């Protein structure tokens, strides 16, 4: 009843309703997906073309942290940009202190602490974004998803946004059918296919597909967008 | 040296169930005598304090210790004893470890509960020197040491203690250019305090 | 023991005519007895038909010139693109110089 | 609801309420011609024992800039101090008179300071007073501006503020033309003030001031205003 | 934010009143009675103990000393009163240090009143729920009696009462008071007023605090005496209460 | 109201603290801690194909000797874990010897009490169980709650189904303190949990933390299967 | 972020500070604790309740040494008492011992604790402490003393008193057995008898905590050599309590 | 710190705290000031408090801000003391900086500025005081009177009353005070002030205080005997 | 509605009502249109006046020699944002001898707007902005909303009744895309687009303002007689 009007107020059942409302805000965004392959990660996202006056291939959504971390988010885009700026500051501080690129689990913990710190007071608002991020470090490839409550986990495949249910079903089938794993290019094709399938929930507007990847054998452990013939091949595979 | 600008000397001795504290009266700037009525001895209840050094620092420390002793009496509902006042003086001095007061304080008293005379001296940063015989301070400290190591006896009646401390003070002050324009002696018993002004050559 | 200043040499000259002004400068930059460069201009056109030269320690002079150009830009922004006259520029430069009264620019300025 | 809350229509509550407060003030009229700008105010004395010479609704910001106020006139003193300081500091920094529009923009930036400043909170509420700023500069000649606690200012050929602003402005719409002389502007200001004032107009209930390039800002004495009122009465009847 | 939980302790009412100040006065009106009487040669303070009136209560709470010449009687919260008393003691010592003279009573009273008023005007904190009766001596006016309330107002009185039965005590004190009374007559009047206004079976010695400020009594110019329970019992026997 | 911030109710209660206690049971996971007179053993009941199981854990390594288990939501759990690690490191730097388990528990309980007394701070809806083998006290289990209350235990259990485990432990101790046996203590705790709850916990259904004299570590799934 | 700069404790229209009254209610819901002052000592006693049967109740002590000659006990909220004890020890060191070289008297330390408790009822954004404290001490110039401190910062000196659930009955019992001539053993016996009434479970040495301010204990002073150097405060072991039972 | 906006605007454009401060001024005792040909007279009403009040030590309402300037008030007494202290400090500072004592108008403007600042600043409440400021400018023989209000408005006035039944006294003044021929001697001004005060204060002549201000810093507080003489003369002339 | 008090409160459906109220403030402003080609970028603005005796409110603000914007909504917020953008461009030039890219300025505005919708004590801005510029990548047009969203478009319109102009721009996209080297034609296309949002008024020299930037053209503003040839 009255327990939903302020952040960091426990309900009688032990709930924080402002965080749940932030999750509701997240559920109204576009679909973002991440796939973990044998030696890297692939991030894919759908961008709605509200008007034909939007310049194609501009308005980039996927963002980069340091030179090896990829991040995408669903929800209120400015909140995601705020979180990415904070993550860039954290990575810079870690690199300055310890002369090594920040490991992915450490970056995930720093982001989680920052998100969680916004559920502790009623003078601030929880972040309205769910973030799928990851990359490659000395231990290998890592993929994580972070929720508005500050909780995060590592995933074999993650999906968020309005079309999250169908994307999760497709990811589960993909994981079940490939116990050994997937290559980076095959992961790019599958991400294109899954984004196209998940868009079928929202047929009212056209969409553009954006894909990025970070792999040891394809980008030498750096994060790079997919823009050339590979992007067209993935689009053709998805539309097939 | 700020400590040797104004001049002045203070002595303290223990005799039987009694104590004695004496000081000179001169106040001069560098070599010109300004005042012959500058007393360096104050008392807060039954505890006596004599301060040598910069006259400004002497007055400031007297005012500050009067402040602190009044507040102590208000909170504790009893007068402060010499043994606790010594610790208070040491802490007050060490709180200015780097901007120190250029002072030579000496504490003399009789403990109300025990009746034992107590005496102590301090440097400018609050190091405590406890003595069973005597304490000296001022520009004529070496002369005072020479007089006291020869004239003092372990147990003296107040009448004899008066003569001993007075002669030590006068003969040490007559060999110090910056000390001596008058002299005051305090003889302190359990229930009586006597103050005497000595006759001196002035110059 | 650091000596944040230098000399850098150079010579400038300003002459005012009946309907014109002239500001001339040497183009030689030296440290003590070596030549840093033979063509390093020290006279600049700082907008609104105003020319400026701050001769002496080169770093301080460059900083002062950059600050004055920025001041002209903000004067245009804040006053509806009004032309900055020469006396107003002189006063603004006086304030810029006196803003470092106790750590001054080591230059002689002519506009 | 804080002091910086948006209404569902897209407006700030405190600014609208301050405008309502301004609507309760006494009437001030400004008229701009090519021979100078005229400002005029009514002196709303509460009691017969109140000495009207102590009521000062028209103040000088600089030799070439004057101002009149309406509403909570106590709040205007801080803004007047700010404007005088801005003009004097501009003269110090640039050896030139400040433009009227720049001074008005500085005053509006100050008025914004119940929230975020113009360059990135000095008070807990917006001002409750509106200003008529008259001036002359070499770039734009004679100018009249209306400044409001919303941080927005306008330029007017003629403007009226205060309790009787609507009727006075309606009269100004039908009576202002670009060929008005200074004396005609003075008579028009007096006539509109007499129309909007409940009390009978005289040399004590109202005062006039003028800004010219030659003589600068000046406030008329009571004798000159009385002569002008007599001239207006004779001309009208 | 936290705007909902703010009670706005420093705002006016539509009638021009401060709610917190009035409520603190009402809180004080339920505390033990204190009375101050000034005669031509001294001052008497008498505080009737109200709380913690039990047999196993060691006397070892209402009368306090500020300096060697000024004392106070407290009505209200004891801990807030102790805070203000510590501040007043520090102020008196600061004045002595600066000017090498004893602080006049009015200056200290006005300083305490200003401290009280500050909590009423600015900040978001509750006012002090304490009323003080000051009894002091100075070379300007001689013997002085003051009172100060949470509103920050201080007033000088010949005879005053603060506490549970201020109306009845003041009505009693308006009569039977003369400008030429002595210290013993003032003591008798204070005890009689306390006995008449007491809402208890008897006015015993263990429910009272007494203090006098006069001249002499094994002291110099001015002596402050805080009565022991035995002295209070002897005074009660002498006056006629015999309780 | 008094039910939104940490102020007293008319009955002297603090509703936000009680609601945080309720929040401590958001995850239906039970944990059990026992002592073996030479070691300390904690076992937790971790329970989607998309998740990476190795990243899911409620057992933290606060320092070389101190281990922690949390009951409650994972964000507050990680908040507390980071705070405890920082406190232990600061203690070791400042005082020159390893932080003991009981002192760390007291420090965390003091922080929780601060949360319960300050309005702008909300309590953390977690229950913290610290285990170690102290060089002065031997095996040690200490537990702190959102109210600021902490105590040491011979053995303890946390979760929704904690009454059954507590009753079974008390019956075992009455039969007869500690366990007189680290692997044997681990198997004892596994069997105790199985008997208290039911079914057969596979290697993926539990996580085990073991604290020995100079170390605290966590067993892998292969080690847990080896116990089974 | 922290915008709670306003008092959470305010006067009601009737003149009552509600939060302090609620803290007093929380105290009155707490377990019983007692203090008795004899001619040659002071006894402070309390009941030890265990949250769980598997909890080592020895690790939690409701009686705490403040100074070698001053100890304390409480009724109310445990964590508040723990924090208050830490603060009281720190204030004892930083306000008196570092200035005069001696531990403070009982009354001055009680006054400092009362100041700390009062500040929590007027400063912004805080809740008053929900405890009541009994403090027992000895000093050279005042002898033995016992004090009670309330959540509002009011403190009173007591010949004997009790706080907690069974406060009224224990107070009546102690009133009926006061004679101004008791010794330490008599006070300990009276305290045990009064506690036996207010304890519902087992009444032994593992469910009672007793402490005494008595005579100096040279054995509890890990060095020899200074004639003027004693810790009067002493906590009775469970074995001694069982023997006295 | 505490910086809540206590004084804000209402939907009708009013600031309620200022109006309530004006009501607080209304609750205060009645003060009056009159201008003479060469003097200013300030009259105040004493509250009918208990007869056990000591007149020597109680504050006497009329306070000398400087040897040539006095101030009286109506409203809360302690707030008035704060304003009086600020005015005295400012007068000394001005005399220091400009080598001349303040004018009456300058001090009035300073006090009004303090009141306005409290009306506009955050975390404080406005003063519940209205003030009358009287005096003579240095080397000037022109009487000066001014009134200041909680909002910050000030004006000069030839005769003015504040507090409680100030309307009746103001009507009496308007009926009896002539601008063309103000009272010539000090006695006439004192008589007018006393007669105006007697219109609301029927509790006797004991509760009336009179202060006379004359140029070259001539400030005299009349004794109770003189005020009683004036009152007896007025009573005698009342009937015949 | 109890959820619209401040900007730190979500609704049960996950909406920020103060942001929506700021958007409503935008929707009541005068229409402005932005357009661009591969070589030039253009802003067209319809001014408004209080009454006949009043001047018209300015709507176009120059940020730097290669960049400017037009506003719709609360003008002081536009002044604050424009001053911030001027400072950022000046910093880029002073420190790197570099002309700030349009996309980076959009990012900066997004970041500055986001911080005002997540913390207590501050309101979101109440203005929408159309930003034109020319940099090393050519001509750019951006649309900024106070929620923090910034979009890059070929053309757009904001303010009251901007839908007609937006539809006109969407229909004639391929035409104005290729108006390279002919600034007057692009300006006339923009004027025709803004003519679609007029209902009871006609464009005059007093209520029409135009701005243009381009490959060789610094950001320039035309008003008054300077627009008489475009009417």
């Amino acid at each position: 009843t009255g327990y939903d009007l302020s952040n960091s107020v426990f309900s009688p059942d032990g709930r924080n309703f402002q965080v749940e409302y932030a999750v509701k805000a997240v559920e109204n965004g576009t679909t973002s997906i991440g796939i973990k392959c044998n030696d890297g990660v692939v991030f894919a996202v759908e961008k709605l073309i509200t008007s034909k006056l939007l310049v194609p291939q501009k308005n980039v959504k996927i963002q980069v942290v340091d030179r090896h971390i990829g991040c995408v988010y669903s929800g209120l885009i400015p909140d995601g940009r705020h979180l990415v700026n904070r993550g860039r500051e954290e990575a810079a501080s870690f690199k300055k202190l310890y002369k090594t690129p920040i490991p992915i689990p450490a970056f995930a913990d720093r982001l989680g602490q920052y998100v969680q710190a916004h559920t502790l007071y009623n003078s601030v608002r929880p972040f309205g974004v769910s973030t799928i991020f990851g990359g490659v470090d000395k231990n290998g490839a890592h993929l994580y998803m972070l929720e508005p409550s500050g909780s995060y986990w590592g995933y074999k495949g993650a999906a968020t946004g309005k079309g999250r249910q169908s994307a999760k079903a497709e990811l589960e089938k993909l994981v079940d059918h490939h116990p050994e794993g997937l290559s980076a290019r095959e992961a790019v094709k599958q991400a294109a296919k899954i984004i196209y399938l998940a868009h079928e929930d929202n047929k009212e507007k056209d969409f553009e597909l954006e894909i990025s990847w970070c792999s040891l054998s394809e980008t030498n452990g750096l994060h790079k967008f997919v823009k050339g013939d590979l992007l067209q091949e993935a689009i053709d595979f998805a539309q097939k | 040296d700020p400590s040797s600008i104004n001049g002045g000397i203070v002595v303290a001795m223990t005799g039987k169930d009694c104590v004695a504290i004496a000081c000179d009266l001169r106040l001069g700037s560098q070599s010109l005598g300004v005042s012959n009525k500058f007393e360096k001895i104050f008392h807060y209840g039954h505890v006596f304090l004599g301060i040598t050094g910069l006259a400004t620092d002497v007055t400031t420390l007297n005012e500050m210790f009067r402040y602190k002793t009044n507040l102590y009496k208000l909170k504790e509902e009893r007068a402060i004893e010499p043994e606790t006042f010594t610790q208070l003086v040491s802490s007050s001095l060490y709180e200015r470890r780097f901007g120190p007061y250029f002072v030579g304080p000496v504490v003399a008293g009789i403990n109300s509960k025990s009746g034992k005379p107590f005496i102590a001296g301090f440097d400018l940063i609050g190091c405590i020197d406890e003595a069973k015989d005597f304490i000296v301070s001022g520009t004529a400290s070496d002369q005072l040491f020479g007089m006291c190591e020869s004239l003092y006896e372990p147990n003296l009646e107040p009448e004899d203690l008066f003569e001993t401390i007075s002669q030590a003070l006068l003969n040490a002050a007559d060999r110090d250019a910056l000390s001596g324009w008058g002299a005051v002696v305090y003889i302190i018993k359990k229930d009586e305090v006597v103050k005497r002004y000595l006759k001196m050559r002035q110059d | 023991q650091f000596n944040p200043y230098g000399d850098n040499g150079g010579t400038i000259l300003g002459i005012a005519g009946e309907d014109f002004a002239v500001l001339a400068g040497d183009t030689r930059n030296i440290t003590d007895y070596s030549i840093n460069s033979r063509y390093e201009p020290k006279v600049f056109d700082c907008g609104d038909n105003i020319v400026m030269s701050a001769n002496g320690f080169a770093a301080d002079g460059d900083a002062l010139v950059k600050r004055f150009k920025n001041s002209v830009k903000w004067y245009h922004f804040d006053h509806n693109d009004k032309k900055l006259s020469i006396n107003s520029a002189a006063r603004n430069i006086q304030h810029l110089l006196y803003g470092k009264r106790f750590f001054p620019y080591y230059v002689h300025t002519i506009i | 609801r804080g002091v910086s809350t948006f209404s569902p229509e897209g407006r700030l509550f405190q600014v609208e309420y301050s405008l309502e407060a301004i609507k309760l003030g006494s009437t001030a009229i400004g008229i701009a011609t090519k021979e100078g700008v005229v400002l005029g105010v009514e002196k709303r004395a509460t009691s017969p024992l109140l000495e009207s010479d102590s009521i000062e609704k028209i103040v000088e910001i600089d030799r070439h800039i004057g101002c009149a106020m309406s509403g909570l006139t106590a709040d205007a003193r801080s803004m007047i101090e700010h404007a005088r300081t801005a003009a004097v500091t501009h003269n110090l920094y640039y050896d030139e008179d400040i433009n009227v529009e720049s001074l008005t923009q500085s005053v509006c930036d100050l008025a914004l300071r119940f929230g975020e400043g113009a360059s990135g909170r000095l008070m807990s509420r917006p001002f409750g007073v509106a200003l008529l700023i008259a001036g002359h500069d070499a770039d734009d000649g004679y100018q009249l501006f209306h400044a409001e606690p919303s941080g927005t200012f306008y330029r007017y050929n003629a403007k009226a503020i205060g309790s009787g602003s609507e009727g006075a402005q309606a009269e100004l719409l039908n009576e202002w033309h670009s060929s008005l002389t200074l004396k005609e502007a003075e008579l028009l200001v007096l006539k509109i003030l007499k129309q909007v004032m409940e009390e009978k107009l005289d040399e004590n209930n109202a005062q006039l001031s003028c800004i010219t390039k030659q003589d600068g800002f000046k406030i008329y004495d009571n004798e000159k205003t009385a002569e002008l009122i007599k001239e207006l009465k004779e001309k009208e009847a | 934010g936290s705007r909902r939980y703010d009670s706005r302790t420093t705002i006016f009412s539509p009638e021009g009143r401060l709610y917190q100040v009035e409520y603190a006065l009402e809180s004080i009106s339920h505390a033990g009675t204190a009375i101050g009487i000034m005669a031509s040669d001294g001052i008497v303070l008498a505080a009737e103990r109200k709380v913690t009136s039990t047999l196993l209560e060691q006397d070892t709470e209402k009368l306090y000393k500020l300096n060697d010449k000024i004392a106070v009687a407290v009505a209200g919260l004891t801990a807030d009163a102790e805070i203000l008393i510590n501040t007043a003691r520090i102020h008196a010592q600061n004045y002595l240090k600066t000017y090498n003279e004893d602080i006049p009573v009015e200056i200290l009273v006005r300083r305490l009143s200003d401290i009280k008023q500050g909590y009423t005007q600015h900040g978001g904190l509750r006012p002090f729920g304490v009323s003080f009766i000051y009894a002091g001596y100075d070379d300007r006016y001689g013997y002085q009696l003051y009172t100060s309330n949470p509103s920050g107002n201080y007033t000088g009185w010949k005879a005053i009462s603060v506490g549970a039965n201020t109306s009845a005590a003041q009505t009693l004190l308006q009569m039977d008071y003369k400008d030429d009374m002595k210290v013993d007559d003032a003591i008798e009047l204070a005890l009689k007023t306390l006995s008449k206004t007491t809402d208890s079976s008897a006015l015993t010695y263990d429910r009272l605090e007494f203090a006098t400020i006069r001249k002499g009594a094994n002291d110099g110019e001015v002596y402050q005496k805080i009565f022991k329970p035995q002295e209070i019992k002897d005074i009660l026997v002498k006056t006629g209460i015999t309780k | 109201y008094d039910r939104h911030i940490t102020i007293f109710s008319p009955e002297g209660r603090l509703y936000q603290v009680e609601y945080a206690f309720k929040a401590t049971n958001q995850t239906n996971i039970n944990s059990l801690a026992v002592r073996g007179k030479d070691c300390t053993v904690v076992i937790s009941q971790k329970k989607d194909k998309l998740l990476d199981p190795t990243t899911v854990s409620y057992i933290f390594c606060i320092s070389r000797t101190i281990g922690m288990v949390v009951n409650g939501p994972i964000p507050d759990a990680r908040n507390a874990a980071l705070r405890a690690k920082a406190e232990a490191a600061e203690f070791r730097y400042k005082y020159g010897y390893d932080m003991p388990c009981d002192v760390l528990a007291k420090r965390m309980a003091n922080l929780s009490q601060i949360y319960t007394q300050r309005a702008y701070m909300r309590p953390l809806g977690v229950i913290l169980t610290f285990v170690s083998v102290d060089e002065e006290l031997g095996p040690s289990i200490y537990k702190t709650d959102p109210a600021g209350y902490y105590v040491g235990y011979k053995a303890t259990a946390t979760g929704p189904k904690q009454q059954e485990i507590t009753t079974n432990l008390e019956n075992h101790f009455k039969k007869s303190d500690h366990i007189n046996e680290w692997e044997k203590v681990v198997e004892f705790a596994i069997t105790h949990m199985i008997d208290a709850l039911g079914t057969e916990f596979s290697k993926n259904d539990l996580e085990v933390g073991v604290a020995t004299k100079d170390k605290f570590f966590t067993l892998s799934a292969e080690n847990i299967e080896e116990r089974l | 972020t922290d915008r709670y700069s306003f008092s959470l404790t305010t006067f009601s229209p009737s003149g009552k500070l509600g939060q302090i009254d609620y803290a007093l209610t929380a105290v009155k819901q707490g377990v019983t604790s007692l203090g008795i002052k004899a001619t040659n000592g002071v006894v402070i006693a309390t009941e030890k309740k265990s949250s769980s049967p598997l909890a080592m109740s020895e690790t939690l002590s409701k009686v705490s040494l403040l100074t070698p000659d001053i100890g304390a006990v409480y009724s109310g909220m445990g964590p508040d008492y723990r924090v208050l004890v830490d603060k009281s020890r720190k204030v004892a060191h930083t306000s008196y011992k570092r200035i005069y070289g001696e531990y403070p008297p009982t009354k001055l330390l009680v006054s400092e604790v009362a100041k700390i408790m009062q500040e929590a009822t007027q400063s912004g954004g805080v809740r008053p402490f929900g405890v009541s404290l009994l403090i027992a001490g000895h000093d050279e110039f005042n002898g033995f003393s016992l004090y009670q401190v309330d959540p509002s910062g009011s403190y009173f000196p007591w010949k004997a008193t009790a706080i907690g659930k069974g406060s009224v009955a224990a107070k009546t019992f102690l009133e009926k057995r006061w004679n101004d001539e008791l010794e330490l053993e008599d006070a300990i016996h009276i305290a045990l008898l009064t506690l036996k009434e207010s304890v519902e479970g087992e009444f032994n040495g593992d469910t009672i905590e007793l402490a005494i301010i008595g005579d100096e204990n040279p054995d509890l002073l890990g060095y020899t050599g200074i004639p003027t150097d004693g810790p009067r405060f002493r906590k009775l072991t469970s074995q001694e309590i069982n023997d006295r039972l | 710190g505490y910086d809540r906006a206590l004084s804000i605007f209402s939907p009708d454009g009013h600031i309620f705290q200022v109006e309530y401060a004006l009501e607080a001024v209304k609750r205060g005792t009645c003060a009056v000031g009159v201008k003479g040909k060469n003097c200013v007279v300030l009259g105040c009403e004493r509250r009918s408090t208990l007869k056990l009040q000591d007149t020597r030590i109680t504050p006497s309402k009329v306070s000398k801000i400087d040897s040539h300037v006095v101030l009286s008030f109506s409203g809360l007494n302690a707030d008035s003391r704060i304003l009086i202290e600020k005015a005295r400090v400012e007068a000394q500072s001005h005399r220091l900086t400009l080598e001349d004592p303040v004018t009456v108008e300058y001090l009035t403007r300073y006090v009004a500025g303090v009141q306005q600042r409290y009306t506009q600043s955050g975390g404080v409440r406005p003063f519940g005081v209205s003030t009358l400021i009287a005096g003579f400018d240095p080397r000037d023989d022109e009487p000066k009177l001014y009134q200041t209000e909680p909002s910050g408005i000030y004006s000069s006035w030839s005769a003015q009353t504040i507090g409680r039944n100030s309307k009746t006294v103001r009507e009496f003044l308007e009926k009896n005070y002539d601008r063309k021929e103000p009272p010539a001697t000090v006695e006439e001004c004192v008589k007018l002030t006393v007669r105006s005060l007697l219109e609301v204060v029927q509790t006797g002549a004991k509760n009336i205080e009179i202060t006379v201000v004359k140029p070259d810093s001539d400030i005299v507080a009349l004794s109770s005997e003189e005020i009683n003489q004036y009152v007896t003369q007025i009573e005698q002339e009342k009937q015949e | 509605n109890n959820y619209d008090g401040d900007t730190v409160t979500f609704s049960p459906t996950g909406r920020l009502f103060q942001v929506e109220y700021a958007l409503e403030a935008i929707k009541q402003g005068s229409v402005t249109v932005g357009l661009r080609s591969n070589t030039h970028a253009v802003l067209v603005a319809l001014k408004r006046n209080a009454d006949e005796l009043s001047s018209y409110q300015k709507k176009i603000i120059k940020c730097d020699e290669h960049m400017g914007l037009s506003l719709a909504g609360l003008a002081p917020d536009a002044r604050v944002l424009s001053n911030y953008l001027r400072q950022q461009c000046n910093y880029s030039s002073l420190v790197f001898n570099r002309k700030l890219a349009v996309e980076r300025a959009g990012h900066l505005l997004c970041d500055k707007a986001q911080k005002n919708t997540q913390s207590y004590g501050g309101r979101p801005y109440g203005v929408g902005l159309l930003i034109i510029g020319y940099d090393k990548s050519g001509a750019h047009l951006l649309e900024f909303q106070p929620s923090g969203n910034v979009t890059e478009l070929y053309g757009t319109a904001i303010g009251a009744r901007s839908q007609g102009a937006k539809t006109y721009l969407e229909r004639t996209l391929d035409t104005f895309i290729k108006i390279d080297g002919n600034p007057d034609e692009l300006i006339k296309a923009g004027v025709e687009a803004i003519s679609q949002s007029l209902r009871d008024e006609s464009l005059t020299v007093d209520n029409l303002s135009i701005a243009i930037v381009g490959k060789d053209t610094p950001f320039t503003i035309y008003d008054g007689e300077a627009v008489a040839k475009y009417i």
Side-chain angles (χ1 to χ4, degrees), chain G residues 53-181:
Chain G
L54 296 181
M56 307 183 302
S57 57
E58 58 175 356
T59 64
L60 181 58
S61 183
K62 300 194 179 186
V63 193
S64 302
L65 180 154
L66 298 186
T67 75
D69 300 334
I70 298 175
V73 79
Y74 79 101
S75 68
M77 298 173 63
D80 290 13
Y81 160 81
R82 191 176 67 254
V83 164
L84 210 49
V85 165
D86 293 324
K87 294 184 176 182
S88 305
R89 293 165 170 173
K90 191 171 181 181
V91 173
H93 271 254
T94 65
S95 185
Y96 208 92
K97 192 178 178 187
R98 291 176 184 178
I99 295 180
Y100 305 106
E102 309 173 333
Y103 289 98
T106 306
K107 187 170 176 296
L108 294 187
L109 183 56
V110 167
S111 185
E112 298 293 341
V113 179
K115 168 186 176 183
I116 293 175
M117 296 186 74
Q118 186 273 347
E119 288 174 340
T121 66
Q122 199 177 21
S123 60
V126 290
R127 167 185 62 77
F129 289 96
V131 302
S132 186
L133 300 178
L134 301 181
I135 300 170
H138 177 274
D139 63 321
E140 170 176 355
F141 286 87
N142 300 277
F144 298 90
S145 290
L146 178 72
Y147 285 87
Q148 177 184 347
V149 187
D150 280 326
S152 66
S154 298
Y155 62 97
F156 310 96
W158 291 87
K159 301 171 182 173
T161 189
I163 48 179
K165 287 185 299 182
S167 305
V168 188
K171 280 177 180 179
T172 302
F173 182 87
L174 297 177
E175 285 169 334
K176 293 180 181 177
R177 303 200 63 171
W178 177 261
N179 51 259
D180 302 313
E181 293 179 2

Side-chain angles (χ1 to χ4, degrees), chain D residues 22-28 44 70-71 160-166:
Chain D
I22 292 172
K23 290 179 181 176
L24 298 171
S26 52
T27 313
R44 185 185 288 176
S70 184
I161 56 183
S163 58
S165 63
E166 296 183 2

Side-chain angles (χ1 to χ4, degrees), chain F residues 8-11 35 106 109-110 113 116-117 119-120 148-149 152 154-155 170 173, chain G residues 2 4 19 22 29 51 53-56 59 79-80 82-83 86 125 127-129:
Chain F
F8 282 118
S9 69
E11 292 73 31
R35 302 181 307 181
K106 180 187 181 185
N110 284 332
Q113 137 74 205
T116 64
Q117 196 173 6
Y120 90 101
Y149 173 87
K154 317 165 185 178
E170 187 180 356
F173 284 138
Chain G
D2 184 7
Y4 293 87
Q19 283 295 311
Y22 303 163
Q29 295 172 346
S51 59
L54 296 181
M56 307 183 302
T59 64
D80 290 13
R82 191 176 67 254
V83 164
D86 293 324
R127 167 185 62 77
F129 289 96

